[PDB]
Amino acid sequence: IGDRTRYFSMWNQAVDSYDPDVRIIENHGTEDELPNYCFPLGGIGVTDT
Amino acid sequence: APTHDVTTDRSQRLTLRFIPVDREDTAYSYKARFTLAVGDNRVLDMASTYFDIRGVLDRGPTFKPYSGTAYNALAPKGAPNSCEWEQTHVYAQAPLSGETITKSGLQIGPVYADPSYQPEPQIGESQWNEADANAAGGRVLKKTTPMKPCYGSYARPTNPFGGQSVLVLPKVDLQFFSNATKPKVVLYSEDVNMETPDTHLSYKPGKGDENSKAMLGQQSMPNRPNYIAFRDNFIGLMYYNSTGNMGVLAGQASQLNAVVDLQDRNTELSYQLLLDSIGDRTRYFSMWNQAVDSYDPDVRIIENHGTEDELPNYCFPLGGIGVTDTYQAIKATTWTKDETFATRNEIGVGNNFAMEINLNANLWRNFLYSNIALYLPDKLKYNPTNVEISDNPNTYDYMNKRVVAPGLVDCYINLGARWSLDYMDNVNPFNHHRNAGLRYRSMLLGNGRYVPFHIQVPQKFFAIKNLLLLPGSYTYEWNFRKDVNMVLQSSLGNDLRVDGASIKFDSICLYATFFPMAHNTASTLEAMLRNDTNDQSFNDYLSAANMLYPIPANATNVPISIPSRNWAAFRGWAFTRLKTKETPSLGSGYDPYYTYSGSIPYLDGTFYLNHTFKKVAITFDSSVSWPGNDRLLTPNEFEIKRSVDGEGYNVAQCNMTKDWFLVQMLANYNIGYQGFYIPESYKDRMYSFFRNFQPMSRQVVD
Amino acid sequence: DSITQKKFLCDRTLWRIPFSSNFMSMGALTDLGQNLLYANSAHALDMTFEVDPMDEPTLLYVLFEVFDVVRVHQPHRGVIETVYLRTPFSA
Amino acid sequence: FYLNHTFKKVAITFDSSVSWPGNDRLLTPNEFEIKRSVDGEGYNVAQCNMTKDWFLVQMLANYNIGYQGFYIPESYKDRMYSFFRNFQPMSRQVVDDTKYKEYQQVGILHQHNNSGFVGYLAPTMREGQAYPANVPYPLIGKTAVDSITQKKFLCDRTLWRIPFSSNFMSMGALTDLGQNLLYANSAHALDMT
Amino acid sequence: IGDRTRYFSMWNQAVDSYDPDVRIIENHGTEDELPNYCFPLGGIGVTDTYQAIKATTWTKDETFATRNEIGVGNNFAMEINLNANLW
Amino acid sequence: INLGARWSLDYMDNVNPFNHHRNAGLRYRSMLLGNGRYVPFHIQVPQKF
Amino acid sequence: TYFDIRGVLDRGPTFKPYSGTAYNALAPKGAPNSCEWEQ
């Protein structure tokens, strides 16, 4: 008689559910085409006089 | 529930299975013939029949159901594996700390390392603060094994312990090193069956694949994803609207074929639109491979609101400090060394050692490159250096190796605007790895190139798809395609005939389910239905004569002439534009010049060139302008969009005209003469005007 | 100094021009489709489309909306007779 | 509920002899076969190991869909604990370890991928050295290994249903078979397997 | 009389709203169970020069270069908590 | 902050939540004009009385 | 019916339709450019 996706605190009405992407893994990999780096706070690092 | 005249109490199967009476597999088509028997006191709703097919499919080597690599994905893209080369030089790592080293190798614990699998590359020291090892060990690749970047590197194991050495059998030779010239390091060198199945080089020092010091800097890059699967609603599998390959439905007694088709009709598109009119096409149903082609809206139209990088992000030393120095404790004006403390104490002064990275800017940039940059028109790309690349641009190798500059679609692109790149408006948005329908349909088959399949295919022809067939025997025959570019779909759209895809149909049956209707009731229904007065009748949903007119490159004016004819009952016109490369020639059983496998708008409804129309003029008897009567603001023709030269007559904050907006709202929802408002969502379906109308604006330097 | 550009996108739909005196849907068999002017005599039709140029061959896909019907008759066991009618633009 | 995929079949008998529903209704008349092993792909549907019989029965029992085509039921009738909403067919390929000659069975202890960059057998500090990965076997590309296909389905939070209706359809709370004199004027024993 | 979640440019019809996760914070933490690291572009970092030697009495191996870069122990690494930072 | 709780900061309850960069309507309406400060505009305004 | 209006708008210098910067966003926030100075 209703939509159980909506919650109502009065009756502690909040249906048990699970993340569908956890129950059934869909592994399409990662979009890691580009390299990612971290750099020296000064922007250069090793320098000489 | 009613207790009489509904169901039969006699023995009767609910589902019947028919074996082909005749099969005829040819060069590019499969022909199956069945004798569809409808017994006495029974009725059959053709909607409950379908062709059950089993066969084998090889998606080919260009099939890649994922982004990234499955091998050492975490390795820096330019980092090499421990290797050697002639100039014999070495560049390696010895992560396993040992007790001592003798001619017998590294002393693991008097047990030495078994050279076939020990030391194991994935085992090193357990803490960040380890004491320099007096003796270490590790593996290394012989100069006879081609150098490849760790990232993407793979070598099948040759022994149950993970060893990858090439069998002869395991040939592992020990090499000792030092700075008493006692050995301090030992490397178990070996050759391995080196592979890089899902990656290609993004940078190669020079020509020729000879191992060298320079080759240590090669950079690897993951290959482009390429989902390959059957089409939405099994489009293409069955011949429709093709005279030389017409289907057959005839009474074994009437002989006449009840199926009469025309190359002029479009049964696949008709089904696509029928389906969306009676249901919610966002839901998937594996049985019919029902998973509509779609695209990520944030990819089609870029909304660049920047990144929330207000806070700096850093990575730190595993010890938390980094550079430290030794100090001695002292006690008090005169200070003396404190003997209660060690003499050498590590203490770091100032803040710790740190590197900095902008996580959100990187994440955003990676999104732009992978989803838009790589999909830019080929004219914006260039050939790689020191890397072979195919001659065929319809090839995966070509599309995978052509390099694109990230700067073309960098994170500062049209900042603050909701705008689709002009270069992308005319690019089929459904041939993309983020097309959910195609991805689902691809994963429905599996994650491998070799797939034995079993599918159920529906009958889409309007004349018989909902027909209630009465008792009698009929010949039911239909033709199926074998052309991979038609039966299969790839997100990249490469030529699957050239790129090794193939399919074979092993068996095909026909299933039919009969409501177990009470026999006295079935008999009565039959008698009534055999009356011409109670003849059944249907209409094709799309209900239209389909015509394709060529538009040569760079042409702008397209006139069409329809010879004098009768127009009684004419309902109207509907239209779009298609790419010739994405429109097979159905005027034959096989199109030799068809070298594309992406979505086929003509058949599936993935239209995307509607913005390229400027205007349309309609005339009857070369004089009478329709609709005329001074109805429109520009009475002699339908103006779809006007250039900045005529902003006045435009609407909704875009270049579309008031006339056109009005006509489309009326035509689709009867909205217009009493105000403009968003139509009820039940009437504003997936292929409707409003739902898809996307006005945009942006500013550029004058 | 800047310049403004406006455009729109409208994927997966078909441009429509109904043969209705007021462009509204008031029935499958349109009012103009019933006009004696288009019944008692034939006419020629000319259409001219102006489109943005594309540096590659393309196709203008025009859908002439009509009635594509069939009436099925099953007078005796094992017999199916069909009458097809498509108008205008009859087979 | 989350164990509905673990059922293979169900046989129903009245008075230790009369098989229900019998009458040669199902493709495998003597029992309700929920799923069949690769040995009987023929009678399976929707690209998974579920049988045509079972799919038909559940569609009829839940939505009266089946005798005039298969299609997605109206969402108002396909609720949270309904069959279709929860039906999840799946497939995957794995190396054929009896047809692929080069096959080697390597346990987790000796598997290495991202060695030198990840912890060993645990979520701890990285260790080891960079090296060609030895897993997983590639199922794509030119060197794709021989593979075997596995099909299955998941169907959580629902209940398998077998309505006591002559045609499995819902034609009223008080079913037609529930009103049959055969089940009214005399008692019967029931056996289920 | 309508669904105000849909936009219509003609009347600038796009209701003012806010991210519910901003108005009411739901802090369930971060899934940072695994450590995240960044590594040297070469994959090793600090290495030292070594000479090859051949066998109780070891002599320098002339078939190998005199200076060979080999790193002992695990590679050089920095650590970062990606999910805590993102949050 | 308030780990494990679903709670709005007390300091924020009386702060207009719609004056924010994550207000979708305002962001859309802003991008409808463009991404620049200088904008020639053309609009249609309805009668509400 | 409706009023069709055309005009010009200057959102001003405080208008910023985005988060972050459009310039060298990837540079450490404290890293300088190659520069020189007197001392």
What is d(CA B404, CA B444) in angstroms, rounded to the nearest whole number? 32
Neighbouring C-beta atoms of residue B276, cutoff 10 Å: 17
How many pairs of residues across B and C have Cβ atoms under 8 Å apart? Answer: 400
What is d(CA D126, CA D119) in angstroms, rounded to the nearest whole number? 4
Is the Cβ pair G25, B358 closer than 8 Å? yes
In terms of residue numbers, what domain contains B188? 68-222
Q: Contact at 8 Å (CB) between B83 and B175?
A: no
- For B580-658, strand residue ranges (E) read 613-620, 624-626, 638-639
What is d(CA B412, CA B568) in angstroms, rounded to the nearest whole number? 57
What is d(CA B69, CA B91) in angstroms, rounded to the nearest whole number? 24
Q: Contact at 8 Å (CB) between D118 and B473?
A: no
Q: Contact at 8 Å (CB) between B14 and B514?
A: yes
Closest CA to D121 of D104, D137, D107, D136: D107
Q: For the domain that residue B687 is a member of, what is the CATH number?
A: 2.70.9.10
Residue reference for tokens 């969402």: D75
Residue B510, strand partner residues: B18, B51
Final residue in a domain of this structure, among B188, B222, B256: B222
Return the half-sphere exposure (C-beta side, CA atoms, 13 A cut-off) of residue B163: 22
Residue B53, strand partner residues: B455, B508
Q: Token pair for residue B139?
A: 């593996």
What is d(CA B660, CA C17) in angstroms, rounded to the nearest whole number? 10
**B24 occurs within a structural domain:** yes
**B98 occurs within a structural domain:** yes
Question: Cis peptide leading into B471, omega within 30 of 0?
Answer: no
The set of residues, in sequence order, having a beta carbon less than 8 Å from that of F12 and lying 6+ positions away, is E23
Interface of A with D in 19-48 (CB under 8 A): 23-24
Q: Contact at 8 Å (CB) between B271 and B603?
A: no
- For D80-134, strand residue ranges (E) read 88-95
Inspect the structure and tell me whether chains D and G have 3 or more CB pairs less than 8 Å apart: no
Which residues of chain A neighbour D88 with C-beta distances below 8 Å?
24
Residue reference for tokens 């594509």: C68
How many pairs of residues across E and F have Cβ atoms under 8 Å apart? Answer: 58
Is residue B581 domain-shared with residue B613, that is, in the same domain? yes
Q: For the domain that residue B56 is a member of, what is the CATH number?
A: 3.90.249.10
Mutation choice for B interface testing from C4, C5, C32, C63 by most B CBs within 10 A: C63
Collapsing DSSP to helix, strand or coil, C43 comes out as: strand
Q: Contact at 8 Å (CB) between D87 and D78?
A: no
Q: For CA atoms B68, B72, B74, B77, give the dihedral sign.
A: negative
DSSP B179-194: ------EEEEEE-B-E
Q: How many residues does chain E have?
A: 87
Element (H, E) at D84: helix D83-86
Considering only the beta carbons, identify the residue of E2, E50, E63 that sits closest to B177. Answer: E50
DSSP H helices, B507-656, are: 519-529, 601-604
Q: Which residues of B183-207 are buried (b: 16+ CB within 10 A; e: fewer)?
A: bbbbbbbbbbbbbbbbbbbbbbbee
CA dihedral B480, B486, B491, B496 (to 10 degrees): 110
Q: Contact at 8 Å (CB) between B285 and D71?
A: yes
Is residue B583 domain-shared with residue B633, that is, in the same domain? yes
Q: Which residue of G has its CA nearest to F44?
A: G4
Interface of F with C in 3-42 (CB under 8 A): 34, 36, 38-40
Is residue B606 domain-shared with residue B681, that is, in the same domain? yes
D140 contacts chain A (CB < 8 A)? no
Closest CA to B61 of B490, B373, B434: B490
What is d(CA B270, CA B276) in angstroms, rounded to the nearest whole number? 10
CA of E15, closest CA in chain F: separation in Å?
Answer: 5
Is the Cβ pair G27, A43 closer than 8 Å? yes
Q: What is the 3-state secondary structure (H, E, C) of B222-279?
A: ECCCECEEECHHHCCCECCCCHHHCCEEEECCCCCECCCCCCCCCHHHHHHHHHHHHC
> What DSSP designation does C50 have?
E
What is d(CA B39, CA B45) in angstroms, rounded to the nearest whole number? 13
Is residue B99 domain-shared with residue B205, that is, in the same domain? yes
Is residue B500 domain-shared with residue B584, that is, in the same domain? no
CA of G7, closest CA in chain F: separation in Å?
Answer: 6
Closest CA to D165 of D33, D61, D89: D61
Inspect the structure and tell me whether chains C and A have 3 or more CB pairs less than 8 Å apart: no
What is d(CA B333, CA B335) in angstroms, rounded to the nearest whole number? 6
CA of E7, closest CA in chain B: separation in Å?
Answer: 8
Closest CA to D83 of D189, D191, D168, D188: D168
Is the Cβ pair D156, A23 closer than 8 Å? yes
* Residues in chain B after which the backbone breaks (C–N beyond 2.5 Å): 87, 109, 168, 179, 332
* Bridging pattern class, strands B136-141 and B185-190: parallel
What is d(CA B41, CA B524) in angstroms, rounded to the nearest whole number? 9
Which residues of chain D neighbour A24 with C-beta distances below 8 Å?
88, 90, 154
> Which residues of B touch chain G, with CB atoms under 8 Å apart?
304-310, 312, 356, 358, 360-362, 365, 411-412, 415-417, 647-648
Final residue in a domain of this structure, among B478, B513, B542: B542
Query: Considering its fold, how many domains does chain B have in total?
Result: 4
D180 contacts chain A (CB < 8 A)? no
Return the half-sphere exposure (C-beta side, CA atoms, 13 A cut-off) of residue D98: 1
Final residue in a domain of this structure, among B181, B207, B222: B222
Is residue B113 domain-shared with residue B176, that is, in the same domain? yes
Q: Tell me which chains share at least 3 CB pairs under 8 Å with chain C.
A: B, F
Closest CA to B293 of B151, B434, B160, B177: B434
Inspect the structure and tell me whether chains B and D have 3 or more CB pairs less than 8 Å apart: yes
* Bridging pattern class, strands B468-469 and B44-45: antiparallel
> What DSSP designation does F25 have?
H
CA of A42, closest CA in chain D: separation in Å?
Answer: 27
Cα angle A20, B682, A19 (rounded to 5 degrees) comes to 5
What is d(CA G39, CA G22) in angstroms, rounded to the nearest whole number? 33
Which residues of chain B neighbour F26 with C-beta distances below 8 Å?
none
What is d(CA C5, CA B700) in angstroms, rounded to the nearest whole number? 8
Is residue B75 domain-shared with residue B90, that is, in the same domain? yes
Q: Token pair for residue D18?
A: 């009369």
Closest CA to B39 of D24, D102, F49, E60: D24
Collapsing DSSP to helix, strand or coil, E63 comes out as: coil
What is d(CA A49, CA B15) in angstroms, rounded to the nearest whole number? 88
> Which residues of G touch chain F, with CB atoms under 8 Å apart?
1-13, 15, 17-19
Q: Contact at 8 Å (CB) between B615 and B660?
A: no
CATH 2.70.9.10 fits D1-87+154-193, yes or no: yes
Q: Tell me which chains share at least 3 CB pairs under 8 Å with chain B.
A: A, C, D, E, F, G
Which residues of chain C neighbour F38 with C-beta distances below 8 Å?
1-2
Collapsing DSSP to helix, strand or coil, B498 comes out as: coil
D193 contacts chain B (CB < 8 A)? no
Neighbouring C-beta atoms of residue F36, cutoff 10 Å: 22
Collapsing DSSP to helix, strand or coil, B107 comes out as: strand
Is residue B596 domain-shared with residue B649, that is, in the same domain? yes
Return the half-sphere exposure (C-beta side, CA atoms, 13 A cut-off) of residue D179: 12
Residue B137, strand partner residues: B96, B186
What is d(CA F3, CA E28) in angstroms, rounded to the nearest whole number? 6
Is residue B215 domain-shared with residue B239, that is, in the same domain? no
B447 contacts chain D (CB < 8 A)? yes
Is residue B230 domain-shared with residue B256, that is, in the same domain? yes
Q: Token pair for residue B75?
A: 């390795």
What is d(CA B75, CA D115) in angstroms, rounded to the nearest whole number? 9
Q: Tell me which chains share at least 3 CB pairs under 8 Å with chain A.
A: B, D, E, G
What is d(CA B652, CA C49) in angstroms, rounded to the nearest whole number? 24
Kindly tell me the burial class for residue D94, based on how many C-beta atoms sit within 10 Å of its own C-beta (0-12, 13-18, 19 or more).
middle
Is residue B55 domain-shared with residue B26, that is, in the same domain? yes
Collapsing DSSP to helix, strand or coil, E53 comes out as: strand
Is the Cβ pair A39, G27 closer than 8 Å? yes
CA of D91, closest CA in chain A: separation in Å?
Answer: 11
Closest CA to F43 of B213, B695, B456: B695
Q: Token pair for residue B331?
A: 């006690």
Residue F39, strand partner residues: G9
Is the Cβ pair C53, B555 closer than 8 Å? yes
Residue reference for tokens 């940059």: B373
Is residue B409 domain-shared with residue B421, that is, in the same domain? yes
Q: Contact at 8 Å (CB) between C80 and B603?
A: no
> What DSSP designation does B534 have?
G
Q: Tell me, what amino acid is at D37? A: S
Kindly tell me the burial class for residue D3, based on how many C-beta atoms sit within 10 Å of its own C-beta (0-12, 13-18, 19 or more).
exposed
Q: For CA atoms B377, B383, B388, B390, give the dihedral sign.
A: positive
> What DSSP designation does B675 have?
B
Output the CA–CA distances (angstroms, integers) from residue C42 to B575, C13, C29, C30, F45, in the order listed. Answer: 23, 31, 18, 18, 46
DSSP H helices, B264-348, are: 267-278, 297-300
Q: Contact at 8 Å (CB) between B451 and B24?
A: no
Residue reference for tokens 């462009």: C23
Neighbouring C-beta atoms of residue F44, cutoff 10 Å: 18
CA of E78, closest CA in chain D: separation in Å?
Answer: 11
Considering only the beta carbons, identify the residue of E12, E25, E28 that sits closest to F8. Answer: E25
CA of A11, closest CA in chain B: separation in Å?
Answer: 32
The set of residues, in sequence order, having a beta carbon less than 8 Å from that of B54 and lying 6+ positions away, is B452, B453, B454, B505, B506, B507, B508, D41, D42
Kindly tell me the burial class for residue B209, based on how many C-beta atoms sit within 10 Å of its own C-beta (0-12, 13-18, 19 or more).
middle
The set of residues, in sequence order, having a beta carbon less than 8 Å from that of B232 and lying 6+ positions away, is B272, B289, B290, B291, B292, B293, B437, B441, B604
CA of G33, closest CA in chain B: separation in Å?
Answer: 16
Mutation choice for B interface testing from D28, D35, D47, D48 by most B CBs within 10 A: D47
Q: Tell me, what amino acid is at G22? A: A
Closest CA to D36 of D151, D162, D147: D151
Which residues of chain B neighbour E39 with C-beta distances below 8 Å?
75-76, 79
Q: Contact at 8 Å (CB) between B239 and C42?
A: no
Closest CA to A30 of B69, B581, B197, B539: B69
What is d(CA B322, CA B299) in angstroms, rounded to the nearest whole number? 42
> What DSSP designation does D144 have?
P
Closest CA to B231 of B518, B489, B9: B489
